[PDB]
Amino acid sequence: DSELQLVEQRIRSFPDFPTPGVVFRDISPVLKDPASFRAAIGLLARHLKATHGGRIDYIAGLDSRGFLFGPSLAQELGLGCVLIRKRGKLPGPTLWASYSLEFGKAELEIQKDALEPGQRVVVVDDLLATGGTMNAACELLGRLQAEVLECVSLVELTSLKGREKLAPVPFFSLLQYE
Amino acid sequence: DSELQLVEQRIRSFPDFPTPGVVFRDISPVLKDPASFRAAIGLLARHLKATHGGRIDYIAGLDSRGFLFGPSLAQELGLGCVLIRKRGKLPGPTLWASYSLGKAELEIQKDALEPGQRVVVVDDLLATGGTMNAACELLGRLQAEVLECVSLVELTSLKGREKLAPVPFFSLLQYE
Numbered sequence: 013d014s015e016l017q018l019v020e021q022r023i024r025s026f027p028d029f030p031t032p033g034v035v036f037r038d039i040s041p042v043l044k045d046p047a048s049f050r051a052a053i054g055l056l057a058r059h060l061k062a063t064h065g066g067r068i069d070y071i072a073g074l075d076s077r078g079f080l081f082g083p084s085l086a087q088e089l090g091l092g093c094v095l096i097r098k099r100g101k102l103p104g105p106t107l108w109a110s111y112s113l114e115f116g117k118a119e120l121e122i123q124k125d126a127l128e129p130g131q132r133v134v135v136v137d138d139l140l141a142t143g144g145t146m147n148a149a150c151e152l153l154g155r156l157q158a159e160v161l162e163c164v165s166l167v168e169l170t171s172l173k174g175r176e177k178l179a180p181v182p183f184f185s186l187l188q189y190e
Numbered sequence: 191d192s193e194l195q196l197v198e199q200r201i202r203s204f205p206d207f208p209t210p211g212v213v214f215r216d217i218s219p220v221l222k223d224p225a226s227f228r229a230a231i232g233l234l235a236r237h238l239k240a241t242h243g244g245r246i247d248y249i250a251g252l253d254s255r256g257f258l259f260g261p262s263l264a265q266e267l268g269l270g271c272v273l274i275r276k277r278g279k280l281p282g283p284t285l286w287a288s289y290s291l292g293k294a295e296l297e298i299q300k301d302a303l304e305p306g307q308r309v310v311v312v313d314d315l316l317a318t319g320g321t322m323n324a325a326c327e328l329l330g331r332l333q334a335e336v337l338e339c340v341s342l343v344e345l346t347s348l349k350g351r352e353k354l355a356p357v358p359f360f361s362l363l364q365y366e
């Protein structure tokens with residue numbers, strides 16, 4: 013697919029970052045090339061509409077790199093975007109959830125009024141690795157009694173089996189790397 | 191301006207967050223109401239086109255809340271968006287710049303821009319101007335020309351606009 017090629021050709025892979033042995037998939041060039049960014053958002057939007065029709069109520073974007081994609085994706089679908097943030101950043105009543113990140117623990121947080129019970133959400137982030145981040149997002153959304161229809165990303169690192177961590181919540185990525 | 195009203199009426203104010211005495215201006219409802227978000231992006235884009243014509247090469251979005259506006263504004267203008275991040279997140283050779291927040295640092299890849307390229311920086315909120323000022327420093331060290339900085343919200347009592355001078359600044363909404 014030519015649209016997909018526009019995205020794939022703008023991922024830049026850095027070896028041994030942030031640790032020896034790991035390859036970092038840099039999405040910066042996708043952002044920098046407006047045709048590449050437009051293609052990425054279009055491909056995600058087409059998958060979501062083809063899969064869920066009118067069922068999606070909101071997109072949820074994940075702090076921080078997921079913020080690059082959430083609002084544009086929401087806009088393309090005619091939807092609003094809600095935020096899930098690293099803990100400590102949101103005012104008002106919140107819920108939070110730990111997850112393992114690198115060698116330690118981090119927490120995500122959501123405003124308690126971000127969604128109402130029964131609302132249907134799709135979560136977007138730039139990249140799925142271990143799945144810890146996306147899994148925490150799903151936990152939070154579940155605790156608001158929201159229904160997570162699907163999680164999506166630009167990049168998926170398939171050897172880390174993040175998709176399995178999210179099951180039974182469906183997952184879709186544009187691009188896959190070991 | 192009813193477009194501007196679509197944005198203003200979706201700012202939510204929280205006293206004493208994160209510290210007693212201040213009022214936090216929460217942009218979350220702007221992002222949640224697609225009409226409000228579209229209005230904000232449209233007002234910013236119209237201002238920038240009216241001020242710079244075709245001279246803007248790139249938008250630079252500031253980690254993290256500025257990431258919510260950078261790509262959409264860039265797309266509206268037909269431009270790419272470059273990233274300025276909190277230090278420690280970017281691969282490859284980088285430059286960084288400290289500012290008072292304790293201390294924090296922003297960072298940019300050395301190859302983010304070429305000398306002479308013209309940039310507009312976007313963030314959600316201008317307060318002291320420390321974050322925006324650090325971004326301008328970084329872009330200047332790449333020999334990029336910062337045409338303007340913009341935000342949705344400006345806290346005027348903190349005099350951030352003056353901190354950035356002579357770089358022009360524009361905000362949609364102003365609060366003390």
Ligand SMILES: O=P(O)(O)OC[C@H]1O[C@H](OP(=O)(O)OP(=O)(O)O)[C@H](O)[C@@H]1O
Pocket residue numbers: 074075076077078113137138139140141142143144145146174279
């Ligand atoms: O699937 P996982 O193993 O949880 O990793 C994926 C997450 O890691 C990165 O975020 P990071 O915490 O590095 O922060 P950033 O979004 O600020 O870059 C990335 O943006 C994803 O959110």
Ligand SMILES: O=P(O)(O)OC[C@H]1O[C@H](OP(=O)(O)OP(=O)(O)O)[C@H](O)[C@@H]1O
Pocket residue numbers: 101252253254255256291313314315316317318319320321322350
């Ligand atoms: O003008 P200043 O006094 O520098 O304050 C403005 C900055 O503060 C907030 O960012 P914050 O560092 O709180 O991080 P966030 O973007 O992750 O919310 C806001 O998003 C601006 O970037």
Ligand SMILES: [Mg+2]
Pocket residue numbers: 074075076077078137145
């Ligand atoms: Mg992330």
Ligand SMILES: [Mg+2]
Pocket residue numbers: 252253254255256313321
């Ligand atoms: Mg910020």
